[PDB]
Write a protein that binds this DNA or RNA. Structure first.
Lengths: 403, 100, 50, 201, 48
DNA sequence: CCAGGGCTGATCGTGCAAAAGTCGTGCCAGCCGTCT
DNA sequence: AGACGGCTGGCACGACTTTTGCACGATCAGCCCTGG
């Protein structure tokens, strides 16, 4: 209900990154508050490698210049970004038509990774079939279904495709295999990664099947009042100086104490939500109870907001996995079996059940609802439909193909 | 994402994957030479959103386009010889233990 | 522009004859720089960008 | 490459700390006194025109304390890194060089023949080169280009930089807190200690 | 074949083509040295 | 000189109701496999 | 080849939870003034 405190207790509802940052932000204001290997080896990857080939070949000044323009618009993931006409306009010419650029852009189609800088899928695959041996049984078939009738192929249906395009069920299917064993997205062939992405907070204790309030590693912003500057307080020269020093000291003590207060709160706060939830970890990701913040403040010795703020932006970590405290929040779901359920558990089960099914005859919604009722979960058919279509799981009736 | 060591990576022929296991791990006794896949493992790259071409492409193949970034072991260019045995350590609590 | 003089004007190095050395005036150092650094932070771990 | 503002003046370490005293040969001041002035003490005098005192004398904290009330605000003096810059910028080289040459050519002796031609040659080389002595004490600080100093990519947890930008971030945050404290009218002792720490960094 | 970035590439191009010529240019170590010297209160630049 | 009353700097409390997000869950529209 | 029935996906009512702004006068012991 306080200013000098209303924030001193909202200053923790953020991540430790920002906290450190704002702590530095206010670490300059208060004088008395304080806390080789240059061998970076380089590489290539279809930008420099693509450019590398450019030089070796015999391309004239006007052609070389153009080459870089198109070799630089090649998105790393696979194909180029902008259209072809774009490229003609970004040369800055009027005498140069598409034909001139066509060649230069056609010549590159056959470099390191055959199919690099293709644009609009079809051209890529089509080219790849050109460098193949013409003494290939499904050469003409594949090509015929590459220039046209691709939409149908893309669909789950294939019978309507063969009947119209003068194709048989036996040979044509095998032509598919030569189009299927053809690798679109050749641009990632010479691609690779080397990332990390990991944050620490409250770890695990691992004591007789239990992880807890453990300890704090590196998250406490060293806030020790300076003693060389504090000695001059009592022996201040003017009134100005004394006032200054005392104001800054009191605010420093305030901040010391608020930082220490924030630590402890979240320190032992990481042992009741996660305990009220001893099924998602031990048993697994399937086996999950519904939990609510309102119910968490009821279990623990504190207010709802108090606990909501501590838990927000606090990535937890157990040898079983690292998930943010706020992500544990789940709605409700009647079950009638000694405890309600959650929709995340619906989603994981839908997914593990679509994984273990017949590949040719797909599983479904009413079927999934019935399976759930068999195990004793009793949910709606909608919740399943929603949780299925939320995970970008394609329709299972459209996921069928030729076994 | 959790890059799972599979046995069906992209941008690689079946002949090269004929030495791998069902869980993706070079059979002990194989005469691995030169630079070949030893332990398949695909890193889950942040998938995109809509972008029509991907949707069409995804359906065409499936479980490959906009999925992962192949990056296995690959015997160091200049090493050869039969592979005596392979050891495998997994974090307790992880639902795996395929070849373990 | 022309897309031809911009690419050819990339290795315009001279003979570097008569290399000398002098003091750096406080007003001449600003000509070498374009901006001014104010924050000690270099890279943020959230999205991996400066 | 970039640069740092550094509103608070700061001297250079390659000068007045090598084998020959570059700032010492221009001001005829011993190395101990110059090093003591730059460390924010000994309260050296700047001008001392009307007051009965030399322009390049030393007046300790007690000396300045008991001399300020005697001469009033006429005796101006500084006790920071900018004191040397202010004392050096107010110097006539073309007028002093002729006087020094005449004194060295007229008053010849055993010890007078040496230790005096060196200063004359230094002043002549400084005048003929067109450089300015106040340029020795810099105001801004150009930073090393970032590409030439990688971050040493580690496993991923901690970057573990090449400890070349650590001095950089230290100086940056020190100058930032100094500029923030200057706007709040801090006591003289606190701001003096802070500027001393910035000079040392 | 040691420091010059465009030099090694042009040499490779000329050897693949079959010309066997050389263009000196300027190495990168001297530029790194100039950039490291300009970082202090010292001025240095190439003249003609 | 000591205890009673007034002034004032220190020190607290880390709470509480209000507006929006979330899924149980029902309704409703479009589409395809098959027998007529 | 189209109606019938299953399948599928989009949309919305409503109970419950998530979060988010609201800046407050109130209070207690040390210090200072004063009567017994």
């Amino acid at each position: 209900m306080t200013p000098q405190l209303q924030q001193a207790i909202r200053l923790l509802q953020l991540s430790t990154l920002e906290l450190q940052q704002e702590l530095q932000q206010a670490l300059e204001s208060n004088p008395l508050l304080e806390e080789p290997v240059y061998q970076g080896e380089t590489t290539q990857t279809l930008q420099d490698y693509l450019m590398w080939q450019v030089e070796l070949t015999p391309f004239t000044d006007t052609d070389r210049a153009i080459a870089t323009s198109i070799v630089d618009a090649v998105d790393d993931t696979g194909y180029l970004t902008i259209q072809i006409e774009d490229i003609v306009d970004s040369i800055g010419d009027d005498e140069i038509g598409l034909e001139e650029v066509e060649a230069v852009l056609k010549r590159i189609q056959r470099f390191d990774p055959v199919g690099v800088a293709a644009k609009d899928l079809r051209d890529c695959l089509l080219i790849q079939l050109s460098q193949f041996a013409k003494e290939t049984p499904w050469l003409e078939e594949a090509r015929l279904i590459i220039s046209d009738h691709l939409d149908l192929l893309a669909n789950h249906d294939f019978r309507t495709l063969m009947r119209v395009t003068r194709l048989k069920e036996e040979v044509l299917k095998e032509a598919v295999n030569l189009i299927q064993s053809l690798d679109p997205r050749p641009g990632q062939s010479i691609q690779t990664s080397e990332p990390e992405y990991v944050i620490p907070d409250v770890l695990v204790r691992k004591v007789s099947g239990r992880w807890t309030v453990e300890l704090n590693a590196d998250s406490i912003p060293r806030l020790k009042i300076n003693q060389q500057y504090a000695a001059m307080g009592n022996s201040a020269r003017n009134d100005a100086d004394g006032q200054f020093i005392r104001s800054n000291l009191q605010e420093a003590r305030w901040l010391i104490k608020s930082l220490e207060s924030r630590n402890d709160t979240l320190l032992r706060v990481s042992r009741c939500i996660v305990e009220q939830q001893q099924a998602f970890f031990e048993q697994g990701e399937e086996y999950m109870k519904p939990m609510v913040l309102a119910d968490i403040a009821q279990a623990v010795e504190m207010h709802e907001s108090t606990i909501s703020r501590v838990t927000t932006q606090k990535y937890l970590h157990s040898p079983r996995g690292i998930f943010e405290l706020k992500y544990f929040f789940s709605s409700h779901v009647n079950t009638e079996g000694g405890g309600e359920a959650s929709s995340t558990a619906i989603r994981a089960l839908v997914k593990k059940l679509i994984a273990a099914e017949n590949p040719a005859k797909p599983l479904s919604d009413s079927k999934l609802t019935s399976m759930l009722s068999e195990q004793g979960i009793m949910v709606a058919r909608r919740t399943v439909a929603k949780y299925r279509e939320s995970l970008s799981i394609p329709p299972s009736n459209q996921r069928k193909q030729l076994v | 994402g959790p890059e799972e060591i599979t046995a069906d990576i992209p941008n690689v022929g079946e002949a090269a994957l004929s030495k791998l296991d069902e869980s993706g791990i070079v059979y002990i006794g194989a005469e691995v030479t030169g630079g070949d896949i030893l332990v398949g493992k695909v890193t889950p790259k942040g998938e995109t959103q809509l972008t029509p071409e991907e949707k069409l492409l995804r359906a065409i193949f499936g479980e490959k386009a906009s999925d992962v970034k192949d990056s296995s072991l690959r015997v160091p260019n200049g090493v050869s010889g039969t592979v005596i045995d392979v050891q495998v350590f997994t974090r307790d609590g992880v639902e795996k233990d395929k070849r373990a | 522009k022309d897309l031809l003089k911009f690419l050819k004007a990339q290795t315009k190095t001279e003979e570097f004859d008569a290399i000398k050395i002098a003091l750096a005036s406080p007003d001449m150092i600003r000509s070498w720089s374009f901006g001014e650094v104010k924050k000690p932070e270099t890279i943020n771990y959230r999205t991996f960008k400066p | 490459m970039g640069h740092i503002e550094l509103a608070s003046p700061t001297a250079h370490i390659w000068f007045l700390k090598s084998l020959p005293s570059r700032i010492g040969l221009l001001l005829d001041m011993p190395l101990r006194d110059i090093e003591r002035v730059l460390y924010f003490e000994s309260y050296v005098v700047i001008e001392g025109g009307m007051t009965n005192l030399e322009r390049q004398q030393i007046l300790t904290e007690e000396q300045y304390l008991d001399a300020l009330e005697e001469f009033g605000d006429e005796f101006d003096a500084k006790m920071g890194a900018e004191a040397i810059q202010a004392l050096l910028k107010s110097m006539d080289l073309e007028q002093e060089c002729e006087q020094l040459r005449e004194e060295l050519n007229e008053t010849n002796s055993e010890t007078k023949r040496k230790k005096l031609t060196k200063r004359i040659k230094l002043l002549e080389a400084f005048v003929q080169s067109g450089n300015k002595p106040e340029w020795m004490i810099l105001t801004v600080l150009p930073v090393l280009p970032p590409d030439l100093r990688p971050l040493v990519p580690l496993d991923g947890g901690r970057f573990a930089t090449s400890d070349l930008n650590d001095l950089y971030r230290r100086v940056i945050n020190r100058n930032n807190r100094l500029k923030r404290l200057l706007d709040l009218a801090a006591p003289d002792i606190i701001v003096r200690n802070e500027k001393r720490m910035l000079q040392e960094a | 074949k040691s420091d010059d970035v465009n030099g090694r590439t042009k040499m490779y191009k000329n050897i693949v083509d079959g010309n066997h010529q050389m263009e000196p240019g300027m190495p990168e170590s001297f530029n790194v040295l100039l950039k490291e010297i300009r970082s202090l209160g010292i001025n240095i630049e190439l003249e003609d």
